[PDB]
Amino acid sequence: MRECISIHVGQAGVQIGNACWELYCLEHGIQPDGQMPDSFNTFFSETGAGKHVPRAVFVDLEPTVIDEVRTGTYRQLFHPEQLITGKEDAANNYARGHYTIGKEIIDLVLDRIRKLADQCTGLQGFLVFHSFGGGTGSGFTSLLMERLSVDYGKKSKLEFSIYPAPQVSTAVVEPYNSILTTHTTLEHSDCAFMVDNEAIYDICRRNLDIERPTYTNLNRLISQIVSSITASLRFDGALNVDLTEFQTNLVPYPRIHFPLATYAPVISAEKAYHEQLSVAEITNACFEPANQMVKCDPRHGKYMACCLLYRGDVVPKDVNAAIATIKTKRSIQFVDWCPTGFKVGINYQPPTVVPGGDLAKVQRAVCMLSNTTAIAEAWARLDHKFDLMYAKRAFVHWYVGEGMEEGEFSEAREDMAALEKDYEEVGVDSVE
Amino acid sequence: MRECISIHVGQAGVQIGNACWELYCLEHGIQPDGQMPDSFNTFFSETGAGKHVPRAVFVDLEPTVIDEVRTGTYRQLFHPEQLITGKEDAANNYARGHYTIGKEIIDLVLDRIRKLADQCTGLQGFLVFHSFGGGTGSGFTSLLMERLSVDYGKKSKLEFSIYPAPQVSTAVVEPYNSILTTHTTLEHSDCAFMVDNEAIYDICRRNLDIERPTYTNLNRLISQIVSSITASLRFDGALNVDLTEFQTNLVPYPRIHFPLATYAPVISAEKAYHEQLSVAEITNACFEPANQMVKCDPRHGKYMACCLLYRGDVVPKDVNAAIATIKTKRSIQFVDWCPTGFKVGINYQPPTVVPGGDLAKVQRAVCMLSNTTAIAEAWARLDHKFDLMYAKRAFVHWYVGEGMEEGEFSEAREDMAALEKDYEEVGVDSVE
Amino acid sequence: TNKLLIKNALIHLTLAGEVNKKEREDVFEAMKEYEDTNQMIILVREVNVPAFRALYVVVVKKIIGGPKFLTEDVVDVFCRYDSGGKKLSKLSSRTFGVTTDVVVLKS
Amino acid sequence: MREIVHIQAGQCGNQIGAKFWEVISDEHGIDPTGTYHGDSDLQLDRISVYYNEATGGKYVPRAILVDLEPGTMDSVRSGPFGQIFRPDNFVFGQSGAGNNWAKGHYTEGAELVDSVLDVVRKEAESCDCLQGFQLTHSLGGGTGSGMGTLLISKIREEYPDRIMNTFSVVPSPKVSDTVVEPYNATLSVHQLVENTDETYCIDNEALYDICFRTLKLTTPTYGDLNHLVSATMSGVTTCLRFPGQLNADLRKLAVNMVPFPRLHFFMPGFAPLTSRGSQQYRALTVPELTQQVFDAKNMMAACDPRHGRYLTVAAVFRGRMSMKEVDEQMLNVQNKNSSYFVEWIPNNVKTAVCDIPPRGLKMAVTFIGNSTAIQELFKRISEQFTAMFRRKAFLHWYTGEGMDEMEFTEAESNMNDLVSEYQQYQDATA
Amino acid sequence: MREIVHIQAGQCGNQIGAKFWEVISDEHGIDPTGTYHGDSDLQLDRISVYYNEATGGKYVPRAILVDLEPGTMDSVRSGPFGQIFRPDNFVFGQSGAGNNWAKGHYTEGAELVDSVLDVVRKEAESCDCLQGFQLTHSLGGGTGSGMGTLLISKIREEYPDRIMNTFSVVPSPKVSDTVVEPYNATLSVHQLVENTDETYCIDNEALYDICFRTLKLTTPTYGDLNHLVSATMSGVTTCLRFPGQLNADLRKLAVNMVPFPRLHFFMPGFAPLTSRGSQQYRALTVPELTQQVFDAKNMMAACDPRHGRYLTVAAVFRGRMSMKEVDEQMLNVQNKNSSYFVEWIPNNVKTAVCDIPPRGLKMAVTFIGNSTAIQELFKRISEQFTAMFRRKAFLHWYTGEGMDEMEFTEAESNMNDLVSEYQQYQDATA
Ligand SMILES: CC(=O)O[C@H]1C(=O)[C@@]2(C)[C@H]([C@H](OC(=O)c3ccccc3)[C@]3(O)C[C@H](OC(=O)[C@H](O)[C@@H](NC(=O)c4ccccc4)c4ccccc4)C(C)=C1C3(C)C)[C@]1(OC(C)=O)CO[C@@H]1C[C@@H]2O
Ligand SMILES: Nc1nc2c(ncn2[C@@H]2O[C@H](COP(=O)(O)OP(=O)(O)OP(=O)(O)O)[C@@H](O)[C@H]2O)c(=O)[nH]1
Ligand SMILES: Nc1nc2c(ncn2[C@@H]2O[C@H](COP(=O)(O)OP(=O)(O)OP(=O)(O)O)[C@@H](O)[C@H]2O)c(=O)[nH]1
Ligand SMILES: Nc1nc2c(ncn2[C@@H]2O[C@H](COP(=O)(O)OP(=O)(O)O)[C@@H](O)[C@H]2O)c(=O)[nH]1
Ligand SMILES: Nc1nc2c(ncn2[C@@H]2O[C@H](COP(=O)(O)OP(=O)(O)O)[C@@H](O)[C@H]2O)c(=O)[nH]1
Ligand SMILES: [Mg+2]
Ligand SMILES: [Mg+2]
Numbered sequence A, B: 001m002r003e004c005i006s007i008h009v010g011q012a013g014v015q016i017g018n019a020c021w022e023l024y025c026l027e028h029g030i031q032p033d034g035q036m037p038d039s040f041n042t043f044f045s046e047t048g049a050g051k052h053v054p055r056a057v058f059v060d061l062e063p064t065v066i067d068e069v070r071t072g073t074y075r076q077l078f079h080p081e082q083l084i085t086g087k088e089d090a091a092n093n094y095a096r097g098h099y100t101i102g103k104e105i106i107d108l109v110l111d112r113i114r115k116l117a118d119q120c121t122g123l124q125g126f127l128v129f130h131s132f133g134g135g136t137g138s139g140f141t142s143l144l145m146e147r148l149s150v151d152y153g154k155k156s157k158l159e160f161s162i163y164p165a166p167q168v169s170t171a172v173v174e175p176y177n178s179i180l181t182t183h184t185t186l187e188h189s190d191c192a193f194m195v196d197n198e199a200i201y202d203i204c205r206r207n208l209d210i211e212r213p214t215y216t217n218l219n220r221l222i223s224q225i226v227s228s229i230t231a232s233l234r235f236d237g238a239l240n241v242d243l244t245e246f247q248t249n250l251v252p253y254p255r256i257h258f259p260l261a262t263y264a265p266v267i268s269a270e271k272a273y274h275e276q277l278s279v280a281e282i283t284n285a286c287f288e289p290a291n292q293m294v295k296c297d298p299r300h301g302k303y304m305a306c307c308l309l310y311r312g313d314v315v316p317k318d319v320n321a322a323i324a325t326i327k328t329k330r331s332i333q334f335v336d337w338c339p340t341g342f343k344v345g346i347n348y349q350p351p352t353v354v355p356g357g358d359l360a361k362v363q364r365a366v367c368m369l370s371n372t373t374a375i376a377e378a379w380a381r382l383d384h385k386f387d388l389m390y391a392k393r394a395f396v397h398w399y400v401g402e403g404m405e406e407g408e409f410s411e412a413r414e415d416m417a418a419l420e421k422d423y424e425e426v427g428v429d430s431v432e
Numbered sequence C: 001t002n003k004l005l006i007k008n009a010l011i012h013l014t015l016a017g018e019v020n021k022k023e024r025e026d027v028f029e030a031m032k033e034y035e036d037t038n039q040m041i042i043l044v045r046e047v048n049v050p051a052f053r054a055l056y057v058v059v060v061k062k063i064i065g066g067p068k069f070l071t072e073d074v075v076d077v078f079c080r081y082d083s084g085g086k087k088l089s090k091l092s093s094r095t096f097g098v099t100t101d102v103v104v105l106k107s
Numbered sequence D, E: 001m002r003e004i005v006h007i008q009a010g011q012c013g014n015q016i017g018a019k020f021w022e023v024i025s026d027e028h029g030i031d032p033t034g035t036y037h038g039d040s041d042l043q044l045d046r047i048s049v050y051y052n053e054a055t056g057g058k059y060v061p062r063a064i065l066v067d068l069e070p071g072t073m074d075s076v077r078s079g080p081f082g083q084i085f086r087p088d089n090f091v092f093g094q095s096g097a098g099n100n101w102a103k104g105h106y107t108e109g110a111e112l113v114d115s116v117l118d119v120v121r122k123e124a125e126s127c128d129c130l131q132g133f134q135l136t137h138s139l140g141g142g143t144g145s146g147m148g149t150l151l152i153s154k155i156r157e158e159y160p161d162r163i164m165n166t167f168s169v170v171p172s173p174k175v176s177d178t179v180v181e182p183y184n185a186t187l188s189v190h191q192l193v194e195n196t197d198e199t200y201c202i203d204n205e206a207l208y209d210i211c212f213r214t215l216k217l218t219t220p221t222y223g224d225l226n227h228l229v230s231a232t233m234s235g236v237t238t239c240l241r242f243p244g245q246l247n248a249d250l251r252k253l254a255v256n257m258v259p260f261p262r263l264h265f266f267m268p269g270f271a272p273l274t275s276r277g278s279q280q281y282r283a284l285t286v287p288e289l290t291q292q293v294f295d296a297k298n299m300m301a302a303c304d305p306r307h308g309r310y311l312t313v314a315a316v317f318r319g320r321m322s323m324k325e326v327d328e329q330m331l332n333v334q335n336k337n338s339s340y341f342v343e344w345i346p347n348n349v350k351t352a353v354c355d356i357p358p359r360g361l362k363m364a365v366t367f368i369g370n371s372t373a374i375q376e377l378f379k380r381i382s383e384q385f386t387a388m389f390r391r392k393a394f395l396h397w398y399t400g401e402g403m404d405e406m407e408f409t410e411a412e413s414n415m416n417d418l419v420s421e422y423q424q425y426q427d428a429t430a
Helices: A012-024 A066-071 A106-114 A141-151 A179-185 A198-205 A218-229 A243-248 A316-328 A376-387 A407-426 B013-025 B064-069 B106-114 B140-153 B172-183 B197-205 B220-229 B280-284 B316-326 B381-390 B395-402 B411-427 C003-014 D011-027 D046-050 D070-079 D111-123 D152-158 D186-195 D205-212 D222-239 D285-290 D321-337 D375-390 D405-424 E010-027 E070-078 E113-124 E181-191 E203-212 E222-233 E323-335 E375-390 E397-403 E407-424
Strands: A003-008 A044-046 A052-054 A123-131 A156-163 A191-196 A261-263 A303-304 A308-312 A345-346 A364-374 B001-008 B044-046 B053-054 B054-061 B123-131 B156-163 B191-196 B260-264 B305-313 B366-371 C042-044 C054-059 C060-064 C074-081 C089-090 C104-105 D003-009 D051-054 D058-063 D063-067 D130-136 D163-166 D198-199 D245-246 D267-273 D313-317 D349-354 D366-368 E003-009 E053-055 E058-061 E063-066 E130-135 E165-166 E198-199 E243-246 E311-321 E349-354 E363-368
Touching: A003 A012, A012 A066, A012 A123, A012 A156, A012 A218, A052 E063, A066 E363, A106 A141, A123 A141, A141 A156, A141 A179, A156 A218, A179 A261, A179 A376, A179 A407, A179 C104, A191 A198, A191 A218, A191 A261, A198 D321, A218 A261, A218 A308, A218 A364, A218 E349, A243 A308, A261 A316, A261 D313, A308 A316, A345 D375, A376 A407, B001 B013, B001 B280, B013 B054, B013 B064, B013 B123, B013 B220, B054 B106, B140 B156, B140 B172, B156 C104, B156 E113, B172 B381, B191 B197, B191 B260, B197 B220, B197 E113, B197 E323, B220 B260, B220 B305, B220 B366, B260 B280, B280 B316, B280 B366, B305 D205, B381 B411, C003 C042, C003 C074, C003 D321, C089 D321, D003 D011, D003 D046, D003 D111, D011 D063, D011 D070, D011 D130, D011 D222, D046 D051, D046 D366, D051 E165, D063 D111, D111 D152, D152 D163, D186 D375, D186 D405, D205 D222, D222 D267, D222 D313, D222 D349, D222 D366, D285 D321, D321 D349, D375 D405, E003 E113, E010 E063, E010 E070, E010 E130, E010 E222, E181 E323, E181 E407, E203 E222, E375 E407
Parallel strands: A003 A123, A123 A156, A156 A191, A308 A345, B001 B054, B001 B123, B123 B156, B156 B191, C042 C104, D003 D063, D003 D130, D130 D163, D163 D198, D198 D267, D313 D349, E003 E063, E003 E130, E130 E165, E165 E198, E311 E349
Antiparallel strands: A044 A052, A261 A364, A303 A364, A308 A364, B044 B053, B260 B366, B305 B366, C042 C054, C054 C060, C074 C089, C074 C104, D051 D058, D245 D349, D267 D366, D313 D366, E053 E058, E243 E349, E311 E363
């Protein structure tokens, strides 16, 4: 009676979606065929026969990565009307994923979401998995967040945006494909979770002792975080928190709604020994600078509204005991106007392991979702990567030729520059 | 409820600590695995599973000696993040243990200590094992005692310095590295115990009849002395003495805090017969000119504040009897201002023999500590070994080229020369 | 006195090759009357891509241009030229000294 | 889907095509007959990008072969992998090459052009989603410069929204095999920066030294130089027809590369280039496969990368490797080559990784440079045009076909900007 | 970690190294191919100091082989352990040796200097913690004195904060195999006190008397002289690549040793040196492996240690022994020889003990002295300069390449202080 659905726009959302839907079948005994040997109705509109198809719409412009799904192990799971493909990709071009080619199949996408809201009576929210890199994942979501607010408007719309790193970038027009996706979705997003590609490599290197992490392994860490946010629907816990409740505790203004996730503990199999990982210990591992999955220095700002999503055998006294240590500490300075900014959710499931993953089986976990202040310097970075590449008019001739104007680039920067004034608007102290 | 961590800076500190942590696992039935088939909470932050990891931080710049630990018998024992290595050693150079390489990994060390004292509610003291020889063992300690006096300040900070021998020295800048590390640690050390190599070679020849003492065998004697100081926490006796209770009895003036250890009886296996080793016989063996573990003549001075730390089956009547024999003797002269200067502790544990060691199993032991007078004649030694190498300005060109001023060498000598005046300040008779 | 640690990094990491040959030959004769001053540091555009922007001395004075004088607070990191691998090596220091040779500014 | 047409023109192009469709057809496991014998089923999942299924389970290449004499077309037909082609494609003339730009574009190019495009149209109606037109010519000769720079201006008249990518062989600095190649080049550069999208400018002079130094051969035949070019040629499109962990195609390798609509002249590269006996000394790891790439000896275009700077840099990999080893090494070389990149382009390493190595190796790297290092390629060619135009030598053949004296200054006026802009966009900062 | 580069220059240097890498290969158990066959796993724990692992578990040396003619490099490549090296390292020239400091530094040293250092730069990028640079040359010749004294003045331009330890065979008093070796050494002494850190002055003269009296041979070939030198050359570094009790390394063998930044000329030593049959007469104890050392017959540098005194005397012991027996003997020989040490250096013995003896012994001693005994090495050489400069014979060859008549007086003025400083700090008391 509470059903959330998921959309997989681009490729970086689709291969993360291969890590999510593999993982849900382990937490419920679901086969890849949909067979199983009662609260899993939040993701699976079932059939009168034995099969549990998922609630997922895989839209893609190029037919490349979808054919790995149509031929892989989870071929039999999905309904083959969900698996929507096309002919030519946007190819890192906002004007080929929002104006030219993305205009074509948009009436096959929304009409497919139309036939999934009728299998639901308690429709809950949206899960668009995408990235800010390409012009498909950040050029078609910007089209599609406009459309699902025309359809509903009053439903929660959660993204999981894979963030462009300050160290490593595998594109060239990537600071053009991020300023354009802000302006289009900022008036119709709900709460976009930032996850960085860079910071997972350090967590795979130091805390896990993996020197060769593949894209198979950077998505296992984003699999458990998405499994932790939606852990309160599929299971009964001590203090549950539904998806409609995230938009009020975490979003202080109609602009600042960019939380960065953080999972803990992350340990190797050999280091499951040698330590005990108490809730008073693993909570201090949340607020380290060395464990944040978006590369900033969190001791260079504040914290407007944190949020802790515990799970496993966790004592709610020791939660209060571990938190009362934290607000007494020195380095972790919250915001003056926020009195005390936590929203703690204790659930009754251990963090389940996937076979083949290099994560130890621990008895408890936490997915901190910290709306910090200091990430605006990382928003200040992707304007300095805009200004130097726009005074020389570099790479503009691909956008102009496919339906995009010159007037809409210094426009959205000033809109982004208005979003950068708002974080220093937070950092003031309105005294007396 | 009482915890005392142990840090092993250098190489000579660590190779003693290879023999120290061998002994505690004998005195508690602990395997090298951390398995075992409320007395051991002072050295083992135990896990809820079966493993008792020690409270140790092995840090060294050169990665040679630490790989013996990571491949030895006690591989599985230590928490592997504790064992900290680096690349280029200080290599007997003070400006490469404090200015060049010491600034590199000081933050991996202190943050690792930071994650040990949070597992401690009753934190008691420090045990920094370091030798005065190298520029790692006397260049990284002097950096580290500055830093841990910023974090804690009030806590007790015990060290164990392997003294430079008066006739035998296996280094050339060793009379430089003693005057350098004194000046830095003298304002922040607590009670620095002097143990000499050369006297342990004497005891291995005469009282033990071993003609080939290896560093396997010169460390078993220091392993018993370190164990008997920390024998009152781990056990329970007729009169116990904690580690904070050392620094008040032993340090009269805040400069003179350099006592020398003495263990007794040190007998071979064949000489366990032929004698009786009574509680009034072994205490006369404590105050010999021969049986001291620093090669000095104790009859060339006085005794400011002795200390006796017995263990084993000891009756406190004869302790009062054997002490009363000692102050009536001729050669032993206490200082005129100290009325009676003893501080006696009795435990209920015989000293445990280690297999392979050539020490005989006895019923009782004594770990004599004595803040004596005449050790400053051996401090007068390490300035005549300084002046002849500073007049001709030898070896200075390695210090200056690695971040070290020239003005900080006659400066620290005068501070060492001020330390020479205070022992002769003691020995006078302030009459009327 | 670290003339070797900076001239090596002028023509291998910051201004190397045939492109800026006219540029780095200017900054040899500019410091010829100098280097009796003890230490000299450079400004670096970014810690990821080290490009040369300004040449300094240690007395912080610019001779060939950012700011004429720097503070300790606006310094991002303190980098050490790894001679064995022609890269940068970060430090834990916040003040100046013999160890630091490469500084990066903030924004 | 995403079908590509492969047109061949000139003698130099038509002998890569005997080797290219041997480079390709050994990856997909294609016999000399036209059938399938491979083991993996991943090959036939994307066989239709270059092929057409015929009756009997046979696959034939989508190649269209153009010549002005039946000389070299008879060699490719009689050669191995020659009977794989569709025999209607072989469109050839009679008058010979002429080694003459004024003949292959104004005299013979004006007759056989419509008999080419109707076979092109027959090959394009059999394709559902047309991607682009990879064309194999060379700037040196007269067939592949008059006819190869005509299908640019005729098929883009028919297909104005596809990708046009030529695979050209550029004249060398030291040796010259044509006396009028300073006239065949400048007449073609005028036609390339009109209606193309990219051009993999490959030299011969740097291609010989790699066969001498790095490959360590003795007698390099053209069967071992085109063996090395066509190895690089298949690596561009191998992410368009095989599953990769980070996908690229012939538009992602078009938008990310080209910063301005004229500066689109590339320079390829390849790794590993072992020796026959020195394949037991170097470790085959990603930090070794990159340090071989960013040295100047491996650049097949005969210029120095340390002269001039880079604008955008691609690095298409193959094989099965890990994305941290890639992203560490793409950071690591940009530290130690920081002065060689340009300032107003940040994060200037485009990177893609496929998952199918070449048949027999373990991993391989295809480099796609884009630099201001090729400013003295055009400075070299436009000077050889200058001295040969003052004394107006060799002019009484082009003028004899009716070509005007101003048009040689017109094409020289076009290259006058293009030399300036690699200087103009070098020291322009912000 | 702590990798070491092993550059080889000159004919004399390139024939020790062919024997030197035969020594290192037998302590770690290395075949001629490159694989592993040893029994102990302690050998491979620090294998990465001289080696780079290649594919298939094969280790190759980190050696860079510099030459001016292809003569001697043909002998090493055709000889055994020739195929262990990497065939890109063999950097050689064409114009012969020359036996000419004006040719190995001004004529052929000007061209082949960057073909060396680019291979040096390729070896250093494959190293994590770069330690130092051991160079195998000889003061006598003209390849190992012009080219070998150029690489120090180019690598310290590139690596100013490392250690540069050269292994120089020094000309003998009686026999002289070069007439102008009094010109070769005094031009090389000018280039080692500039930019080195230590220099093992090994002679030929005293090396035969060890091979005649102590070893009791009849016909000493160079295959047995360099057999004896390389036994010392591997002993200095075995406290870095094997676990020891009281450790030492190349920087601990720098700060302990060198009192002033110019007096860094060391003299080697080794024990035991048995006869073939007289190994059954002498006891193999540490008090016998010390009295063999501190006598003058064991010194490989041909000078009398009793003339002049010592400054810092290190003695790296090896094998399984006990530290009391060590420190008893290092005290005993300082009591009985106290007049041969200097007054103002107290406690003047550095001592190291490792635990892996050579294959077949039980314990071994490597002696690294330092003395004022080599005032009459420089009193010998600088006078042979002097009588060959009053008439200024042999000058019309070095001047012929462009060398000035003051530059010979500059290098002679450099040695004029260095003779005085072993006299200035000899009787300086306090
Ligand atoms: C059956 C047996 O034990 O034979 C011994 C042996 O009899 C004696 C006589 C050897 C032997 O040495 C010689 O005959 C000799 C000849 C010319 C020059 C120098 C030595 C031996 O050849 C040498 C050899 O030494 C080694 O193997 C060391 O690892 C040595 N290796 C080499 O020198 C070497 C020789 C050939 C090829 C490659 C390496 C070494 C020493 C220091 C540092 C590294 C390596 C040894 C113990 C033996 C023999 C075979 C007879 C002695 O020498 C050494 C260097 O060990 C000479 O006095 C010692 C005492 C040894 O007992
Ligand atoms: N989390 C995650 N990110 C990935 C993975 N593969 C690629 N990426 C990221 O994807 C980003 C590029 O955007 P993509 O989504 O792959 O591209 P696209 O949306 O399909 O658009 P085009 O490729 O231009 O058609 C890069 O920043 C990569 O870091 C993966 O397996 N997991
Ligand atoms: N008691 C004892 N002393 C030792 C032992 N090993 C070395 N030493 C002493 O250590 C002193 C040398 O200092 P070290 O601490 O070993 O050197 P270091 O501080 O590690 O620095 P490096 O010089 O870089 O190795 C000498 O005086 C030795 O006698 C040992 O096992 N036991
Ligand atoms: N790489 C390569 N270059 C070739 C080959 N054949 C000819 N060339 C080059 O092509 C140029 C001559 O042009 P060519 O194509 O034969 O003349 P055309 O037939 O009129 O186009 C010269 O620069 C030749 O080096 C070949 O097989 N491989
Ligand atoms: N110990 C030793 N000395 C050698 C050897 N070969 C040559 N020498 C000495 O090297 C000197 C001649 O120098 P050489 O290196 O051959 O000339 P270069 O090639 O110009 O450097 C003479 O003193 C020779 O005795 C050798 O194998 N061993
Ligand atoms: Mg895509
Ligand atoms: Mg050490």
